Amino acid sequence: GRQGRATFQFLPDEARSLPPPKLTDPRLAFVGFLGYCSGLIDNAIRRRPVLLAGLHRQLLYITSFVFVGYYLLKRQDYMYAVRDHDMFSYIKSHXXXXXXXXXXXXXXXXXXX
Amino acid sequence: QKRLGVDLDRWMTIQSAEQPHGIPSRCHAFEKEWIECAHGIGSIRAEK
Amino acid sequence: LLQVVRDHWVHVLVPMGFVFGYYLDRKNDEKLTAFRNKSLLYKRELKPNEEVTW
Amino acid sequence: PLAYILGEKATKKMTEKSKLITVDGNICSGKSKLAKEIAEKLGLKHFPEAGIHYVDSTTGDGKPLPVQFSGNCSLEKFYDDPKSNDGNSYRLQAWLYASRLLQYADALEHLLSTGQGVVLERSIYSDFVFLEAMYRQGFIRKQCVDHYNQVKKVTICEYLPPHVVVYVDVPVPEVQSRIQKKGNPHEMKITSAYLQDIENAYKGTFLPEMSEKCEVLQYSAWEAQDAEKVVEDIEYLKYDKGPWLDQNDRNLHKLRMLVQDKLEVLNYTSIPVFLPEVTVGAHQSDQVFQEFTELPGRKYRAGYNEDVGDKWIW
Amino acid sequence: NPIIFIIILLTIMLGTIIVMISSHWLLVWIGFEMNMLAIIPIMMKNHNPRATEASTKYFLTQSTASMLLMMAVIINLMFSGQWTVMKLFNPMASMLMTMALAMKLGMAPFHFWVPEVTQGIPLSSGLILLTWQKLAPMSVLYQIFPSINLNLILTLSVLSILIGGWGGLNQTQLRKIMAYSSIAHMGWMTAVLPYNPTMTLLNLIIYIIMTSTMFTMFMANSTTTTLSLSHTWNKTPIMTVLILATLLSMGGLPPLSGFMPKWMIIQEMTKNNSIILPTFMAITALLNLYFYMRLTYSTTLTMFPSTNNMKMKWQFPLMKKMTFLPTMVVLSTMMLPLTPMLSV
Amino acid sequence: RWIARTFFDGPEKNYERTMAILQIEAEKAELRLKELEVRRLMRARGDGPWFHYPTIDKELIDHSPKAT
Amino acid sequence: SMVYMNIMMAFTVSLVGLLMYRSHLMSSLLCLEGMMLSLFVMAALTILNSHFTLASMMPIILLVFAACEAALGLSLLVMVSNTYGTDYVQNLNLL
Amino acid sequence: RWQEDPEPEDENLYEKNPDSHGYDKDPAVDIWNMRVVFFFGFSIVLVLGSTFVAYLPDYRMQEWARREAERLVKYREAHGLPIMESNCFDPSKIQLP
Amino acid sequence: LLDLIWLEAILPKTISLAQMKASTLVTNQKGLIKLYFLSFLITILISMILFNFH
Amino acid sequence: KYIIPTIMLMPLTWLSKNNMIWVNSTAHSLLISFTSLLLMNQFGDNSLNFSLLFFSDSLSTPLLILTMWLLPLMLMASQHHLSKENLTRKKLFITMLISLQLFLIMTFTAMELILFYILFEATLVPTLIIITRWGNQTERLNAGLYFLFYTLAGSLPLLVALIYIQNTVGSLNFLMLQYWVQPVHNSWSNVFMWLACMMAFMVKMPLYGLHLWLPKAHVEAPIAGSMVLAAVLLKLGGYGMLRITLILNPMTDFMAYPFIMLSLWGMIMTSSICLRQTDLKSLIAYSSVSHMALVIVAILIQTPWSYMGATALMIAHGLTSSMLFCLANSNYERIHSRTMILARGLQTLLPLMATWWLLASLTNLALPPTINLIGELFVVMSTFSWSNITIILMGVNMVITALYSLYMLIMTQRGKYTYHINNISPSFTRENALMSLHILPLLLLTLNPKIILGPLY
Amino acid sequence: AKTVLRQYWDIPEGTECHRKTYATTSIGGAAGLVVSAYSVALKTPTSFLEGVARTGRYTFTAAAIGAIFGLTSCISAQVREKPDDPLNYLIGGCAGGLILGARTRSYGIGAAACAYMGLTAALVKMGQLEGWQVFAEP
Amino acid sequence: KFYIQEPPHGSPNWLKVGLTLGTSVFLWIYLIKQHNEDVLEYKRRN
User: Fold this and answer.
1) Sign of CA dihedral B15, B17, B18, B23
2) Edge-to-edge strand ranges of the sheet holding D165-169
3) Per CATH, is G2-84 categorized as 3.30.390.30?
4) Which of K85, K124, K126 is most worth mutating to test chain J (most J CB atoms within 10 A of its CB)?
5) I need a labelling partner for K80 at 20 to 30 A (CA). Which of E241, J78, J328, K19 fits?
6) Phi and psi for J398 in degrees, rounded to 5?
7) Is residue C23 part of a domain?
8) Motif span (Cx9C motif 1) (chain B)?
9) Distance (Å, rounded) from C-alpha E140 to C-alpha B1?
10) Backbone torsions φ then ψ of E295, nearest 5 degrees
11) φ, ψ of residue A47 in degrees (nearest 5)
């Protein structure tokens, strides 16, 4: 859950940079659509003709959301792995806490109608 | 701390730390037990 | 060739959009490859062709 | 506009031999137009008097907008013969006040950036004389005047300095003969009591204008049309202990930022209080706003537009 | 105002940095009072009778807030005597800690200043500096998440949404509605703090961005519902569509990313065998939506605010984050539901 | 038979498939139930590196003072 | 134990004195000085008895920030006496 | 009085001016829209579409089970003694007590 | 009786109650820093004695 | 394959020129509706899986095809309306109908309880804007406020219910995964667990109580009688009742027993009011309560016969009631007031429409088997196995269903129309097209509705 | 007080009636003082004359709400078997919520609150089971 | 129209236009090269 063996300064840990990063993911494309959407409504608030065909500062709007979104997804791929890693290590160390139950054909009540 | 102070020192907060010259704390010996007892997370969440 | 691009600029997008949906959802079959040849329900040892079920 | 820490600053290479000189109080006839045209030797820029077509002339593109699109059923010819039952009366005056607030905002912006002598033909501080004279006779409802005073209290207080030199013209009560002498069929056949009340209200309005520490000068009909007499009096008389004299760092910049954009200054002019005379209907205003969008003036942007310019897309 | 306005604004930015990057108890004490000296000049600005009354009402409530907070710091010397921000170590000091932070925030019992302070602020630039200011007491609450009693935090969170949900119904002032949504959202903030301290930081991210999108779109001058009414026809009709995306998102609606806090606050609480409290959260949240329900009718309808004066010149405001932030405020529920891990 | 080709997936698909989706679903459900079981234990007793509150100090001072 | 039964009591008495009013706004700021004075003594006794040596600088810093509030809030009080005649809690306009 | 609101609009053409039309504005586009592209979706999706609604999609083993049941009736009557039904799913499983 | 008046009434009751309880928080305490601070003394007294946490 | 052609319908309307618009929005949606009937009709032994859970599959959903069928049908009806308005707002409006249909594709395909719910509530926002704008009548805001007051106060209890179940038992997500189902032991804590799951679908599926949500939305119509078809889709949008009762709680249905009884008077007393009322749209609005009450009676019995009748009735009502709103649209566009007494007289002015009036009114009754008889008859035969006394209550409803159709006919058969100078032109080519494209799919489902009433059939 | 609320879950375990009614008035009277404490801060005209009257209208009524709810709980305990039922104390909440329209002569506000107070007080007696907790730690 | 009465913007900037088109490409190169470095890092670590 909470942070234990992790410190601040530089958002990814770099020591645990083993997992592969997101390459051409559908999650990157949707933020890329939002980067395009931010480059559509800027010509709506500041009065500029045609949201699709206007000024080409939209390339900055696409790149910025992709750039920030890539490192944000890199933080997502890191933190979900660490949370899973500390969960698996807790079961392997204690063993007594997590109990296993197998093979059962227990009788249950049957409902009418 | 919400944001940690890495590669910089600005602490000097806890008792029985680095003395101004050599002057001791009134409860210096007792924190030599307390800090050494609770340096790990074992007695931080449970405190037993 | 010259008039068709200006008049039917939007008319091509929707059927081509269906092709994009036809291709993207087809590519999801490689993500679900666990027990493709395994699991006894329609499992058979194929020899002339590799991976019968997609 | 925002970053003025560098070379561009208020009162830098300005506010020396350059002052706002308002030529106002022409009673009824166009007498102020002759005096303002004559005062072009000392003053660099002389703005014409604001009317119905001024709002489209400024900020737009040369030619004025049609009568249906610019001001909803608003005309100067309707006020020439003012009548009851769903007429103009007040809504033309509210449009006239909005145009005079717009020209003063442009003139003050023209004064702060590049210091020049600006001559104005009837300012904001002369508008209530033009309204109250119409109120004395049965033309405007009592509630509309109080609506005007609510706009008066907000819009004026935004501008910290009023004027430097205010010119006062008091003509004879036989000024209607001079109006008949001028070639104007619309301006003729106006009420003589209305013009007499306009001169009577101006006498009680010139006293607080002179007491507001601004240099007020009175002129007669014989003294009028003199290029040498008017210019020598403007140079000799110096403005002392006035509200115009303010701090360049704090007071002048906040004034310049508020006058930089036309929409920011006119934001206070639009009042939320509902009035039957001030056009409330949205159903016909929806098509009227759509007709303005259909018009090939601005419609698309602040500057560049399709079938008007646009050298590059980016 | 030249550089001095930016320097004062930078010291609020620096002030919260002292609160964020800290270990000492007197260090955060300075960080709060660094803001107290720096918000007041922006509270004044335009030399108003309302600005003088708001700043005095703001100070006398928040100066007492800090001195109540310093009492909790001194009791932390009376018992234990450790000056590290981790735990209060007292059942008495924890009471005087949470209630002092409740004074600076818009929590239930100390809420009376919030609407009257927001009314007295001269410009939209000063209105941000209350929504951004609430990051400073929230940052301390994240540090001292244990040793604080449920009976005097959760009661203050439940009551705040109740009084927030009834506190904007008899109000038409646009500043007053935003001030009571502040009181409403603070109930959703502190309710998470016992049931995992995480997501409280993300609740800030959603709230601060969504509130900043409002006032940057309120750069076209409007103080009342009737003044924001004359905007559909006299002003641009596309601007009413983009404010609609921010009005509806502040209330609990799933197609918009303002449901993303109401996603996890209920989810984390239901994990810990509590169902009767999250029911009370969601039902009272509809009263918070109800303010925006009547406020959407100012933009969706005609409502007849025509006005004879028509603007021909195009509006030129600041609009610094008025384009980038509403795109994230409208849609992020489909984009980043895994952002819980990235933030905390 | 013509409708079966280039318009139908077939009975072999969604039988070999869907069971693959269930295999991921079983892993997603069991580990989420394990996560609810682990957090119920780790919050109650401070044993693992989950929901652990920060301590005061690891090392502050050890040098010889002028004490009594 | 002995002294702390009075200086904590003086803090709670001043806590009542702040929130209780008889129309005078000057008396509230005067009590804010007393609040910092009571916090000064309570901090002094905790640091001086348990020989900290390092923490002795902290109430000196607290004394600086005591006067920071009790001047900038006092300057706003003067602005009330500029807009209005005399300073009163009853004399307000906000709703 | 509103001085702006009174402007009513009542114009229903239908037959007056276009003579033969489905909708107003541009008669040449109207024939191509109201009578052509509406009717192509009326022809393909309803007539060529009807050969997919019930006409040969096999559909959840409705005709498959007929060939399956017929061979199982003759099998369990000639060789077996019970008539295709006796006990469901559980032949001598784990008891309740 | 039923479909318009009585079967509706149940939730218009909660609408009327929410609009009536709105006045007890908005319109209540007209100005005065005295009135706002006097209520703060009570909230501390409730937390100390009534909703007791030591 | 149903993701990103409806999303590709979004830039189509914006990019197309002002002369076109309506020609592109309809033609590039009819071929999309052809592909739904081409691919989704295939089934194996049980439920399939088209893809990983973003949009899942079909188990008993030919109701998805109906929404794809109404994908161009709403654009057909709103042709005389929105003809005098702004061209930019026309592009804004069609996208809002597309967005409704976008989430409607998602809700029927996705076999989740968590992803389904948030997109079930994502249909609420576009409808709110569609109702509160372009509303021809005054006090349309009450139709907007109560739309989100009745629904959200009942549906937000799903968040405290659904997350509670997955915290205890595995996860709801995949549904076909959810066969870890433990029988509910009937405890006082489980009382509100059942109620919160049901009350969310007691609002959109109108009972006798909490039913005022529906007629206010129809009387204060979104657009004349054109966008009412989307509100018909919201009625059948409460199909989660088929999934919740089956999976989440099969043992404890003792609390279902009072809710059938509450909906039993939501059959007779909801049909009694629908006899005297003046508004022609309200005479469809209150009749739509009774026909959708049939499903609420059916589902809570949980017998295999009721599911066959219910799934048929969801498709039956979606094409019959919506067709009746198109008849109400054709009368409102000429007279501009929906008074039944005023608009009186067919055949004298509208000869061909009178036959379409019959093929739409009589379908409320049990005609030669279309889908309505097949829908109703299985439910009535299911209620007898529940209890023998039901047909005495159900038989009264069969009498007033004739008092639905014939009363709509007789009040239009009376040849007078003395005051009416308008309604001179009979019907447009697109006007009669609405009458055909609604009734001919019902006429084609007379032959073999095997791929309509299919929860394991 | 927390000590008085913990006493409330020990008296109905037996059959004590005369001390159960006093235990409910001590909660209702104190809670009546809480609601009335805010009403003093709402500008009371003539101090210690109508301010005492403002306390007298709230504290007496709220204690009487607790008194009837206390008494009807004992009547429902003696008559009919099975002591632990949600329906048993539902009538107690209805009778206790009946005198909300006794403060002012209206008989409509109290009648509307009769169903609301009757259901909410029943939920408290439903909250004796493990499946209902207002505040939680883990 | 021909942008009469002094136009505020004609857009021949090349200072802001050169940087917006410039830095975007600088962002493109910085993201791909680190992605190529991370692709080599993922193979080397595992």
Assistant:
1) positive
2) D45-47, D118-121, D21-24, D165-169, D215-219
3) no
4) K126
5) K19
6) -70, -25
7) yes
8) 27-37
9) 8
10) -85, -20
11) -65, 105
